[PDB]
């Protein structure tokens, strides 16, 4: 059909674009077909140096509204042909991007959505004319077909507009700390209160934040009573007595402040790779405090990921760190970590002579923690657990690599910004949580 000839022209004009855009444009086109996003389809057609006619919008199903069967039989056959002419890696990436960029739920109706029921049906239909070996190979790898609401990553040291320093007072503390809260909400506000009021050394606040991170709430609270016993802090005696009584009136689950802290921490860790090219800073000569950490991390992560992925393992942005680490882990959350540890053994074998091996491994593992806890809850301590498992610990020990992530977060000052910015947002979060 001539409409099929128009569809080939559209698809092949995508392939006349620079090779670095074929995957993006094909994924976007498949999304626009599956969601009837008329503006997106017009944008793609104009971006591949074509002209969008209303006949093209009608044929591409732009004016359709069937969110349960988005591709018409004709359009479905067109897509099946175009996907059959595709390479397996390319077809896998295109289908993964198209399905994971499409929400299942959306408050704002008329934003194209496709239920999981529909995505599960579309996936085998789209590869119906595909080579059956490639098809089942894709059905095996394409296991996560759901929407990926990619959380943003943060880097306050370069003027990130996202960062907001918490506004916790001695007054707002006492009113909220009237222990209707639990131990977590109590420790978060206390560390948030000690941070704004300068009730401790920079390494002390980092030591409290590392005790909270590793769920050493008994160790963390004990060091807080010890800090209050100081005489230069009881005034900044009557309100400090109120802080002690709260430590015996607490509740005890609904660990949303815990989940928010871990998620926010991962976004700051993953945000290390942000730069002025990935965050528009439309205002303004001093180097950021995390610049050496960022340089050392991007060096370690490039050495490690390109060791397995080749040139395709290059990492320059937070998203690429997220993407290449997930790809590398596919060569449950604790299962993905154990595979990483197993593959790192190959790296630590080839690079056992490297004087930066321990620092590179540890910097990379920090990013792995940031990648997984940024994509799901409970993942942070799950990664921490296997990394600290004695069998994994022995694998690292056999290469001269120490992985003690508690001492790393407690003692190393380059990780202080991660905890501080996470504990900052967790204080603001827990402030408004108990303020309702």
């Amino acid at each position: 059909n001539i409409r099929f000839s128009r569809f080939k022209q559209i698809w092949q004009a995508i392939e006349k674009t620079p090779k670095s855009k074929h995957i993006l444009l094909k994924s976007l086109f498949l999304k626009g077909l599956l969601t009837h996003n008329k503006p997106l389809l017009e944008e793609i057609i104009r971006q591949i140096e074509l002209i969008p006619y209303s006949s093209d919008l009608e044929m591409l199903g732009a004016f359709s509204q069937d969110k349960a069967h988005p591709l018409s039989p004709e359009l479905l056959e067109f897509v099946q042909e175009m996907l059959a002419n595709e390479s397996e890696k390319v077809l896998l990436t295109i289908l993964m991007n198209a399905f994971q960029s499409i929400p299942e739920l959306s408050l704002d109706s008329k934003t194209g959505t496709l239920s999981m029921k529909t995505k599960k049906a579309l996936l085998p239909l789209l590869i119906e004319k595909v080579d059956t070996s490639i098809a089942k190979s894709i059905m095996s790898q394409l296991t996560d077909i759901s929407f990926d609401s990619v959380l943003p990553a943060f880097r306050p040291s370069i003027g990130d507009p996202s960062y907001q320093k918490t506004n916790i007072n001695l007054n707002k503390y006492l009113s909220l700390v009237g222990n209707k809260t639990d131990i977590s909400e109590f420790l978060i506000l206390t560390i948030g209160l000690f941070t704004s009021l300068k009730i401790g050394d920079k390494g002390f606040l980092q030591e409290l934040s590392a005790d909270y991170l590793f769920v050493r709430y008994d160790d963390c609270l004990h060091k807080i009573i010890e800090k209050l016993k100081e005489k230069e802090v009881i005034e900044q005696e009557k309100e400090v007595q109120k802080i002690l009584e709260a430590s015996g009136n607490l509740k005890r689950t609904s660990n949303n402040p815990r989940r928010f802290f871990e998620t926010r921490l991962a976004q700051y860790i993953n945000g290390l790779s942000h730069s002025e090219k990935t965050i528009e800073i439309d205002s303004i000569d001093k180097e950021p405090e995390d610049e050496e950490l960022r340089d050392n991390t991007l060096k370690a992560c490039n050495k490690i990921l390109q060791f397995f992925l080749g040139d395709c393992g290059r990492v320059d942005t937070p998203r690429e760190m997220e993407q290449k680490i997930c790809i590398f882990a596919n060569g449950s959350i604790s299962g993905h970590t154990c595979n990483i540890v197993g593959m790192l053994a190959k790296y630590m074998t080839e690079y056992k002579e490297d004087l930066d091996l321990q620092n590179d491994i540890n910097l990379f593992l920090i990013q792995v923690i940031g990648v997984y806890a940024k994509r799901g809850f409970h993942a942070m301590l799950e990664v921490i657990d296997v990394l600290h498992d004695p069998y994994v610990q022995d694998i690292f020990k056999g290469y001269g690599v120490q992985v003690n992530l508690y001492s790393y977060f407690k003692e190393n000052p380059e990780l202080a910004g991660f905890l501080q910015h996470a504990m900052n947002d967790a204080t603001t979060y827990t402030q408004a949580l108990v303020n309702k």
Binding site: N97, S101, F307, F308, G310, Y351
Partner: protein, 246 residues
């Protein structure tokens, strides 16, 4: 020369380079001169990389490496970019002429790095356009440079004429970077400012249009955590096997 694992002496040198220890760098390179050009793929960390990949290059330190015969023919960052390519990417005339005076090789694709930031409206300024003209001037001329390819068959002039701006919603605005270059290539400082404001106005209009129609259909999944705007990536020319296979 390629050294996959930096030796203790090379790390000591690179440490002194980053810390700006002029006497230590000089004294290291006096006793062990072979350290000056040792790079470590795929990161390509090297004494040279420690000075080149900074916001503000320490040319006093760079002169020291030049005195001990540093070369500019190997990649100096994990983008596998040569020193000249990095100067073109940043449109840094100060670094670019410094390298050409020190006989740094100009790859054929090096002009195409002048365009990696041509997707960002904020880079369509007078100084950036003038700097590119001063850079294209040192590479010959607009017509001499427009012919050079980018390892994908695309020519600089065809690429500069078929440029585009990307907004934070992923929408594009086609514009002519060659014409912007041609409007000032050494009165003209008003012809460009009218061409820029024509594009600045067209970009702001399309950005408002895409805010209402594209929304985050592109940005949410395909741009979050990436470069904003996405750079115009020069096609890959230098390929390297993975360490797991070598």
């Amino acid at each position: 020369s390629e050294m996959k694992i930096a030796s203790a002496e090379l790390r000591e040198l690179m440490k002194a380079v980053s810390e700006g220890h002029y006497e230590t760098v000089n004294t290291i390179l006096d006793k062990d001169p072979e350290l000056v050009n040792q790079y470590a793929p795929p990161t390509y960390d090297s004494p040279l990389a420690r000075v080149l990949n900074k916001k503000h290059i320490d040319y006093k330190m760079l002169d020291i490496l030049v005195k001990h015969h540093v070369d500019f023919d190997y990649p100096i960052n994990y983008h596998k970019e040569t020193p000249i390519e990095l100067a073109c990417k940043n449109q840094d005339l100060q670094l670019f002429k410094y390298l050409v005076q020190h006989n740094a090789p100009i790859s054929e694709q090096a002009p195409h790095f002048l365009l990696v930031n041509s997707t960002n409206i904020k880079y369509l300024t007078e100084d950036k356009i003038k700097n590119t003209c001063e850079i294209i001037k040192l590479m010959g001329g607009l017509e001499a440079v427009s012919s050079k390819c980018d390892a994908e068959g695309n020519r600089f002039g065809e690429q500069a004429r078929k440029s585009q701006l990307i907004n934070r919603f992923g929408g594009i605005v086609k514009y002519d970077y060659m014409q912007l270059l041609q409007s000032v290539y050494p009165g003209s400082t008003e012809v460009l400012t009218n061409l820029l404001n024509k594009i600045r106005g067209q970009f702001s209009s399309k950005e408002t249009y895409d805010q209402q129609n594209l929304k985050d259909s592109i940005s949410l999944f395909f741009m979050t955590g990436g470069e904003i705007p996405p750079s115009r990536k020069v096609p890959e020319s230098r390929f390297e096997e993975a360490g797991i296979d070598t």
